[PDB]
Amino acid sequence: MVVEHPEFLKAGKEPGLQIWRVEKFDLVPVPTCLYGDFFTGDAYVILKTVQLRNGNLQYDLHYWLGNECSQDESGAAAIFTVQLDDYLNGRAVQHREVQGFESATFLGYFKSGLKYKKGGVASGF
Amino acid sequence: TALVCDNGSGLVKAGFAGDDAPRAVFPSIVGRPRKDSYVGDEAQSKRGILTLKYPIEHGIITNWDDMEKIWHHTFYNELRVAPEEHPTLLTEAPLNPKANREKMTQIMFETFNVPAMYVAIQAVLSLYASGRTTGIVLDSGDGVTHNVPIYEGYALPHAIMRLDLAGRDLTDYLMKILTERGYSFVTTAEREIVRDIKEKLCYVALDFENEMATAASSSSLEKSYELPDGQVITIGNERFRCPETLFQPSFIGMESAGIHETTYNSIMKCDIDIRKDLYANNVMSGGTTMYPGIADRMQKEITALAPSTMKIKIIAPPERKYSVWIGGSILASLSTFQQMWITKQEYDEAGPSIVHRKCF
Ligand SMILES: Nc1ncnc2c1ncn2[C@@H]1O[C@H](COP(=O)(O)OP(=O)(O)OP(=O)(O)O)[C@@H](O)[C@H]1O
Ligand SMILES: [Ca+2]
Ligand SMILES: [Ca+2]
Ligand SMILES: [Ca+2]
């Protein structure tokens, strides 16, 4: 308000799936080849952009929390989500996704099935 | 480096953004000659020659001159920092009056010279700390209890509930019933002992009636407590009678409904399309929520109040005495938070009114 972050400038510009990982209090893009491989020690923010026939863009924001992620990571993913929504004129619908309890919709973003892997980036505290 | 100050009616929580806990915790008190002042423990110790005062009443700052002392002590005595060098985040009560928010902004910029500041609502920060952007918070401290429902990052002012029954009132109550049992706790020094017993031996009963009866039978609920003076006392049904007051304010002669009801009630004041989210995301926050058994009783208490098929959930993190502070430490630490601060530049241009447009 008004955020200057370069990832913010890139979010929701066109239909597709964008995935960022929380890395010591920053929003860091995930390599597109790695989509669906989630570190259970980390937390992520996903933006799903779909085309409307009125020419406008629909938005769904989901923050995903691994079983062993630290508090600073889970807290930051949630805040980033709020911020991304506001920047998008509040047009996004927000969703909380917990490991092993994800929603059917989110699970469907990943055509070859999502996968869990142990580990992650270290805490930022 | 950013600082986070969480100013409570009973305790000030202070530290540095990026730390996983407050560095300084101390009583929010100012003592003056019955240097020209003391703050915190120092004040309490020399209480015999001082007049003691609490500048925050029920979460609301009410004595500006005394609050500046608190802040000064915080900066210079506890944190050992030069205020003019650090952007500073402060917390406030929900429904904090317009002119109070302006006052805080003015003092920081005009008296302390901070390069930047920001005010955030205590309950919202707790929600952030639990990794949620939607839920309803039960925040209970030493001076105030609130229910604060939050959607997609923002409180819903219309549905927030405030209750002037909390920790201090519980400590006072345990005092009265304990002397009622035959002991005698009346003095300030004695208030202090009871508070320690309140925090060490008390708990919330899952079924208050059975608990009473089970305490009148054997003596399996009874516990021993060694006084500072060496005497030993035996504490009984008061362990669970004291926090019962949170659910039955009638105990202390209060007319309000308990915290389970005020919770249900705040929720029902919200748009029907979000209630389920609320019901499933009940976050506990603050010191007076630390009684053992508190999360199970509330879990019991609200499934009774809500439709039998409602998915209900209470979240009571071990560290919730600091959840507010931790929420702030995270918020102020984020890469994206840079442009959120109110600059000295913005203040000089607009004045204290700027706070209403920069901080929700
Ligand atoms: N383990 C414990 N069990 C019960 N009560 C406790 C526990 N630890 C602390 N308390 C109580 O919590 C209160 C301090 O809580 P807290 O720091 O959250 O309050 P505050 O921020 O100063 O007040 P408020 O938010 O009401 O303005 C005291 O009343 C204290 O006795
Ligand atoms: Ca991690
Ligand atoms: Ca939105
Ligand atoms: Ca508080």
UniProtKB/Swiss-Prot annotation, chain A:
| Gelsolin-like repeat coordinates | 25-107
Annotated region Actin-severing: the residues are: 2-125
**Sequence positions that bind Ca(2+) 2:** D85, G90, A92
| Residues annotated with Phosphotyrosine modification | Y35
What does the record say about tissue specificity?
A: Phagocytic cells, platelets, fibroblasts, nonmuscle cells, smooth and skeletal muscle cells.
Indicate which residues the UniProt annotation says bind a 1,2-diacyl-sn-glycero-3-phospho-(1D-myo-inositol-4,5-bisphosphate): K111, S112, G113, L114, K115, Y116, K117, K118
Superkingdom per UniProt: Eukaryota
Sections of the chain in a coiled coil: none
Ligand binding (Ca(2+) 1): G41, D42, E73, V121
Q: Where is this region: Actin-actin interfilament contact point?
A: 72-75
Q: Which disease is it linked to?
A: Amyloidosis, hereditary systemic 4, Finnish type: A form of hereditary systemic amyloidosis, a disorder characterized by amyloid deposition in multiple tissues resulting in a wide clinical spectrum. AMYLD4 is due to gelsolin amyloid deposition and is typically characterized by cranial neuropathy and lattice corneal dystrophy. Most patients have modest involvement of internal organs, but severe systemic disease can develop in some individuals causing peripheral polyneuropathy, amyloid cardiomyopathy, and nephrotic syndrome leading to renal failure.
Q: What is known of its domains?
A: Comprises six structurally related gelsolin-like (G1-G6) domains, that, in a calcium-free environment, are packed together to form a compact globular structure in which the putative actin-binding sequences are not sufficiently exposed to enable binding to occur. Binding calcium may release the connections that join the N- and C-terminal halves of gelsolin, enabling each half to bind actin relatively independently. G1 and G4 bind two Ca(2+) in a type I and in a type II manner. G2, G3, G5 and G6 bind only one Ca(2+) in a type II manner.
Query: Subunit details for this protein?
Result: Binds to actin and to fibronectin. Identified in a complex composed of ACTA1, COBL, GSN and TMSB4X. Interacts with the inactive form of EIF2AK2/PKR. Interacts with FLII.
Family (UniProt): Belongs to the villin/gelsolin family.
Relate the protein's function as given in its record.
Calcium-regulated, actin-modulating protein that binds to the plus (or barbed) ends of actin monomers or filaments, preventing monomer exchange (end-blocking or capping). It can promote the assembly of monomers into filaments (nucleation) as well as sever filaments already formed. Plays a role in ciliogenesis.
Task: State the name under which the record lists this protein.
Answer: Gelsolin
Q: Which residues of the full protein are shown?
A: 52 to 176 of 782
Curated annotation (Swiss-Prot), chain B:
Q: Which residues carry this modification: ADP-ribosylarginine?
A: R162
Spans annotated as Interaction with alpha-actinin: 95-108, 343-355
Q: Which residues carry this modification: Tele-methylhistidine?
A: H58
Q: List the catalysed reactions.
A: ATP + H2O = ADP + phosphate + H(+)
The UniProt keyword set, sorted, is: Acetylation, ADP-ribosylation, ATP-binding, Cytoplasm, Cytoskeleton, Hydrolase, Methylation, Muscle protein, Nucleotide-binding, Oxidation
Might you give the EC number(s) for this enzyme? 3.6.4.-
Gene Ontology terms: biological process: actin filament bundle assembly; actin filament polymerization; mesenchyme migration; positive regulation of gene expression; skeletal muscle fiber development; skeletal muscle thin filament assembly
Supply the SUPFAM superfamilies for this chain.
Answer: Actin-like ATPase domain
Q: Does the keyword Heme apply?
A: no
Q: How is it modified after translation?
A: MICAL1 and MICAL2 produce the (R)-S-oxide form. The (R)-S-oxide form is reverted by MSRB1 and MSRB2, which promotes actin repolymerization. Can be mono-ADP-ribosylated on Arg-162 by SpvB of Salmonella spp. This modification blocks subsequent polymerization and leads to cell death.
- Any idea where this protein resides? Cytoplasm, Cytoskeleton
SMART domains recorded: ACTIN
A GO term for molecular function: tropomyosin binding
Question: Which of the seven top EC classes does this enzyme belong to?
Answer: hydrolase
Q: What GO terms fall under cellular component here?
A: actin filament; actin filament bundle; cell body; cytoplasm; filamentous actin; filopodium; lamellipodium; skeletal muscle myofibril
Which PROSITE patterns does the record cross-reference, listed alphabetically?
ACTINS_1, ACTINS_2, ACTINS_ACT_LIKE
Query: What InterPro entries does this protein's entry cite?
Result: Actin (IPR004000), Actin/actin-like_CS (IPR020902), Actin_CS (IPR004001), ATPase_NBD (IPR043129)
N6-methyllysine: which positions carry it?
A: K69
**Further remarks about this protein from its record:** In vertebrates 3 main groups of actin isoforms, alpha, beta and gamma have been identified. The alpha actins are found in muscle tissues and are a major constituent of the contractile apparatus. The beta and gamma actins coexist in most cell types as components of the cytoskeleton and as mediators of internal cell motility.
Oligomeric form and interacting partners: Polymerization of globular actin (G-actin) leads to a structural filament (F-actin) in the form of a two-stranded helix. Each actin can bind to 4 others. Interacts with alpha-actinin. Identified in a complex composed of ACTA1, COBL, GSN and TMSB4X. Interacts with TTID. Interacts (via its C-terminus) with USP25.
Family, per entry = Belongs to the actin family.
Q: What is this protein called?
A: Actin, alpha skeletal muscle
Give the organism, scientific name: Oryctolagus cuniculus (Rabbit)
Q: What is the lineage of its organism?
A: Eukaryota, Metazoa, Chordata, Craniata, Vertebrata
